[PDB]
Homo-oligomer: A and B are copies of this chain.
Amino acid sequence: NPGLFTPLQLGSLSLPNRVIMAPLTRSRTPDSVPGRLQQIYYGQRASAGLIISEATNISPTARGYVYTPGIWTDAQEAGWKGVVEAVHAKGGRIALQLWHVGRVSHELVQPDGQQPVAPSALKAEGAECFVEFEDGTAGLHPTSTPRALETDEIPGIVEDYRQAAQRAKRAGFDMVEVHAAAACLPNQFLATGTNRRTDQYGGSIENRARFPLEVVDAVAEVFGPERVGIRLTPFLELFGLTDDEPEAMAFYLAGELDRRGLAYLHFNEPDITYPEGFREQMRQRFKGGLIYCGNYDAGRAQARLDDNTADAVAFGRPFIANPDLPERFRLGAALNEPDPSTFYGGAEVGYTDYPFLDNGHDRL
C-alpha cells in the first residue's frame, strides 16, 4: 500500500519517494555544454524521487533542436559531471535521457548540412523542429525528408548510444533512460507508419523492435540493466508518426525487457486513450518499475499506486513550476503556475526563478 513518500527500489537504485521529475527539454544550453545554470536548475529539484534529464543528443546528427545539450564530447561530459555532482550534493539521483531525433530534424540543424536519417525515407508531415537560421535568429521550421539508414549503418548508431552511455557512467549519472517516446529515431523503427523497411529492421513486430532492443542492450552493458530505463509512448501519434500495432508492440517489448531485468518502463500517456485492461496487462508482463506520466496530480498519482498499476509517477510541467513539488504534495500546498512562454530558450527567467514553499523557518 505505497504512498507518494514511500521509498521505492527502482532497479538497484533506492528512491526516497515516488514523485519523479519527467524529462523536460528547456533549450538553455546554447553551446550544448551544461553549466552552472544547470547545476542550479537541477539542484533545486534534487528532492525528486528521481530526476530524468532533458533529452540529450548522443551525436551531432542526433539533433533536431538547437540549444539542447549533448553527451558526445569531452567538454559536454565535464559540464554534465558538474551538474551530476550538484544533484548529488543536494541529495538527489539523476538519469540521463539518451536522444536521437531521427527524421524530426532539418539540414539547417544537422552538421555540414547533412540529410536527417530514419528507418524509411518518409517526411514527418506537419512536424516542426527548432532551428538557428544563418542570420543568427532561431525558430520553428518544417522538418525535411530523411534518408533511410543503410542496413550497415545501424551498428554505428547503436555505438553512438553505447558511447553516450559510457560518457554518462563516467560523469557520475545514476542511470540512463533510452528515449523512444516522441520525436526520436527508436520510436520511428517501432511504428508501422514510419518503418517500411524490408531488411531485418522492418516488417514484423520482432524486426521493428530489433534496433531499439540493441540500443537497450548496448546501454545495459555499460550501466547494467538494473540501472537502465526506457520511455515508450504506445497509442501516441505525434510528429506525424502513425502505428497500426501499438498494443502488440507494447506487449512484446514489455516481455523482452522484462527478461532482460530492466529497471523500468516509463509511459507518457495518451490524454486516443488506452484500452481497458492495458495497465493491468503491463503490470503482469513487466515485473520491474512502471512509471506513468501525463497530467498527474497528487490524487490521481495515488490512485495508480492503489491500483497496483504503477510503482511511481512522473510529473513534467508541475516540476518546471515547482522545484519542491514532492513537498507541496505532502502538505497539499498550492502549486506555482507554469509559464509556457519560458518553457524553451533564454536563461534564468522561468527556469531557476520559480520559488520554494516558505515554511516560516528556512533562511537564505
* A residues adjacent to B (C-beta < 8 A): 3-7, 9, 12-14, 16-17, 19, 40, 43-44, 46-49, 85-93, 172, 174, 323-324, 326-327, 329-330, 348, 352-359, 361-364
CB < 8 Å neighbour of A92 from B16, B172, B354, B363: B16
Closest to A328 in B: B89
**Whole-angstrom CA separation of A14 from B49 in the bound complex:** 12
Q: Taking A359-B40, A363-B356, A364-B357 as contacts, is the C-beta distance between A5 and B88 under 8 angstroms? A: yes
Q: Are A6 and B91 in contact (CB under 8 A)?
A: no
Q: Are A85 and B362 in contact (CB under 8 A)?
A: no
Measured CB to CB, the closest approach of chain B to A168, in angstroms, equals 14
Q: Are B46 and A5 in contact (CB under 8 A)?
A: no
Q: Are B6 and A172 in contact (CB under 8 A)?
A: yes
CB < 8 Å neighbour of A356 from B5, B174, B364: B364
**Whole-angstrom CA separation of A241 from B93 in the bound complex:** 43
Question: For A93, what are the chain B residues with a Cβ–Cβ distance below 8 Å?
Answer: 7, 14, 16
Question: For A90, what are the chain B residues with a Cβ–Cβ distance below 8 Å?
Answer: 47, 91, 324, 326-327
Q: Taking A352-B361, A355-B364, A356-B362 as contacts, is the C-beta distance between A91 and B89 under 8 angstroms? A: no
Q: Are A364 and B361 in contact (CB under 8 A)?
A: no
Question: For A7, what are the chain B residues with a Cβ–Cβ distance below 8 Å?
Answer: 88, 93, 172, 174
Measured CB to CB, the closest approach of chain B to A6, in angstroms, equals 7
**Whole-angstrom CA separation of A354 from B47 in the bound complex:** 20
A3, A48, A354, A359, most chain B CB atoms within 10 A: A359
Q: Are B359 and A355 in contact (CB under 8 A)?
A: no
Question: For A362, what are the chain B residues with a Cβ–Cβ distance below 8 Å?
Answer: 44, 323, 352, 355-356, 364
**Whole-angstrom CA separation of A4 from B172 in the bound complex:** 12
Measured CB to CB, the closest approach of chain B to A22, in angstroms, equals 16
Measured CB to CB, the closest approach of chain B to A351, in angstroms, equals 9
Question: For A174, what are the chain B residues with a Cβ–Cβ distance below 8 Å?
Answer: 7, 14
Q: Are B40 and A326 in contact (CB under 8 A)?
A: no
Measured CB to CB, the closest approach of chain B to A318, in angstroms, equals 14
CB < 8 Å neighbour of A85 from B19, B324, B330, B359: B330
Q: Taking A7-B174, A85-B330 as contacts, is the C-beta distance between A91 and B49 under 8 angstroms? A: yes
Question: For A44, what are the chain B residues with a Cβ–Cβ distance below 8 Å?
Answer: 361-362
Q: Are A89 and B329 in contact (CB under 8 A)?
A: yes
- The 10 A-B pairs of least Cβ separation, nearest first, read A355-B363, A14-B14, A47-B91, A358-B364, A89-B330, A352-B361, A5-B88, A89-B326, A5-B85, A89-B327
Closest to A5 in B: B88
A5, A16, A324, most chain B CB atoms within 10 A: A16
Can you list 18 contacts pairing A with B, beta carbon distance less than 8 Å?
Answer: A5-B88, A14-B93, A14-B174, A16-B87, A16-B88, A16-B91, A40-B361, A46-B91, A47-B89, A48-B91, A85-B330, A90-B326, A352-B361, A353-B361, A353-B363, A356-B362, A356-B363, A364-B364
A44, A326, A330, A355, most chain B CB atoms within 10 A: A330
**Whole-angstrom CA separation of A3 from B356 in the bound complex:** 29
